[PDB]
Structure formats: structure tokens, C-alpha cells
Amino acid sequence: EPGSQYQQQAEAGDRRAQYYLADTWVSSGDYQKAEYWAQKAAAQGDGDALALLAQLKIRNPQQADYPQARQLAEKAVEAGSKSGEIVLARVLVNRQAGATDVAHAITLLQDAARDSESDAAVDAQMLLGLIYASGVHGPEDDVKASEYFKGSSSLSRTGYAEYWAGMMFQQGEKGFIEPNKQKALHWLNVSCLEGFDTGCEEFDRISK
Numbered sequence: 144e145p146g147s148q149y150q151q152q153a154e155a156g157d158r159r160a161q162y163y164l165a166d167t168w169v170s171s172g173d174y175q176k177a178e179y180w181a182q183k184a185a186a187q188g189d190g191d192a193l194a195l196l197a198q199l200k201i202r203n204p205q206q207a208d209y210p211q212a213r214q215l216a217e218k219a220v221e222a223g224s225k226s227g228e229i230v231l232a233r234v235l236v237n238r239q240a241g242a243t244d245v246a247h248a249i250t251l252l253q254d255a256a257r258d259s260e261s262d263a264a265v266d267a268q269m270l271l272g273l274i275y276a277s278g279v280h281g282p283e284d285d286v287k288a289s290e291y292f293k294g295s296s297s298l299s300r301t302g303y304a305e306y307w308a309g310m311m312f313q314q315g316e317k318g319f320i321e322p323n324k325q326k327a328l329h330w331l332n333v334s335c336l337e338g339f340d341t342g343c344e345e346f347d348r349i350s351k
Contacts, residue, residue, distance in 0.1 A: 145171040153180060158187040165195055174199055190224030197230040201237075204317040209240035225255040225263035232270055236279060239318035245280040259294065268295035269304045276308055276330065277320055289333065302339025305330050309342065313349065324349065 144150070146167030152160030165180035178199055184192030197215035201207045213234045219227025232248035232255075234240040248270075255267035272291030275284045288308070295304035309330035315322035328349055334342025 145173075153183075156187075158184045158189045158192070161187075162189050162192045162195070165192060169195065169199075174202065188222055190219045190222030191226050193219035193222060194224050194226040194230045197227070197234070201230075201234065204237075204239070204319075207239060209234060209237055209318065213240045220251070225261075225267070228252065228255040229263065229266050229270060232267075233319075236274065237316075237318035243279075245274060249274060249280070256294075260298070262298075265295050265298045268292070268298075269307060272304060273308050273311060273320070276312075276326065279319070285329070292330075292333070293337075296337065300339065302334040302337030302342055305334035305337060306339050306342045306345070309334055309345065313345075 146153075146164045149160045149164035149167065153164040161180045161184035165177045165184065168174070168177035168180065178196065181192040181195040181199070185196055193215050197212040197219060200212035200215065201209055212230065216227055216231035216234055220231050228251040232251040235244045235248040235251070237243065252267045252271045252274075256264040256271065258264060268291045272288040272295065274280055274288075275291065276288035277283070289305075292304035292308060296302055309327050311320055312323045312330060313327035328346060331342045331346040331349065335346050
């Protein structure tokens with residue numbers, strides 16, 4: 144059973160267990176169960192649960208409620224969640240969520256990344272790199288972007304953050320990143336050369 148480890152405490156009303164149970168369901172792909180548990184946690188003021196609910200509202204950028212994601216993510220940040228800061232930043236770069244504020248996104252992410260050895264720093268540095276790579280905040284700064292992706296990958300898997308960025312450019316994210324084959328190939332090349340073999344494979348595929 145997914146999230147068996149959290150179930151008893153969650154049912155007992157433990158806010159944190161409710162959150163970790165929700166997160167387990169997100170990973171298992173049951174977003175309805177994820178929502179149910181994250182709502183229970185959010186009722187008790189949990190910021191990470193509010194962040195998770197925000198993420199669920201933009202999980203599909205074609206069928207999203209970017210505006211409510213923003214309100215949830217603001218509440219998450221106010222509740223003290225670094226995960227909240229990351230989701231809020233992801234909203235604030237997106238034209239669908241309201242007026243964009245990329246500068247604010249960057250500060251939110253720099254806060255979430257301030258403990259550079261932590262889990263929050265993984266996603267925070269990935270989004271910081273994508274922002275600098277994207278050219279939505281002045282001219283592209285691919286060297287700076289590479290530094291952020293290296294930081295993210297060093298906490299996770301080498302070359303992974305770069306691969307994720309490559310795929311973001313390949314696929315696009317409506318309201319934020321236009322699909323761009325040139326940028327996709329740039330970052331998949333970096334991923335490959337950092338030693339992430341999936342990067343090499345997708346580079347080859349998109350090239351041929």
C-alpha cells in the first residue's frame with residue numbers, strides 16, 4: 144500500500160503525517176487522494192500541504208487554475224514553507240497566474256535554496272537555472288544557469304537538472320517557456336557531458 148507508513152498518524156489527525164501521505168499519493172499518481180490528505184493538513188495550517196495543493200492546481204499547464212495556485216502558494220509561504228516559495232516562484236513566472244514578477248520569483252527561490260545541502264535547494268536551484276536559461280528575465284545567461292543546475296544535480300544526480308531543463312525546453316510550459324529545440328539540445332548536451340546517459344539518448348533522438 145502506498146504511504147502505509149503515514150496512514151495511522153494521518154487518520155489520528157497528525158498534520159505532518161497527512162502531508163507526507165498526500166505527497167506519497169502524488170508520486171503514486173492518485174491526485175484525488177493526494178488532494179484529500181493535503182486539504183486535511185492545510186486545514187491545520189500546514190504550509191507544505193498548501194504548497195502541494197498549489198502544485199496540484201498547475202500540474203497540467205493546459206488545464207490549470209494558476210490564479211488559485213497563486214493564492215495557495217502565498218498562504219504556504221506565509222505559513223513558513225520553502226516548498227511554498229518554490230511553487231509561488233513557478234506561478235509568478237507564468238502569465239496565466241496573474242501579472243508576472245520574475246524578480247520576486249528569483250528572491251523566493253534564493254531563500255528556498257539558502258540551505259544548499261537541503262531538499263528544498265534541489266527544486267529551487269532547478270527553477271533558478273531555468274529562469275536564467277529561458278530569457279524571460281533579460282538576456283539568457285546560460286553560464287549562470289549552468290551553475291544553478293550543477294548545484295541542483297550535485298544534491299540529486301549529476302546531469303539531472305540539466306536534463307530536466309532540456310526536456311522543459313523541448314515540451315514547453317504554457318505561459319512560461321515556449322518550446323525551443325535549440326535550447327533543448329543545448330541543455331541535453333550539457334546533461335550528457337555531465338554524465339547523465341538519458342541526456343545523451345534524448346540529444347541523439349532530437350538531433351536525428
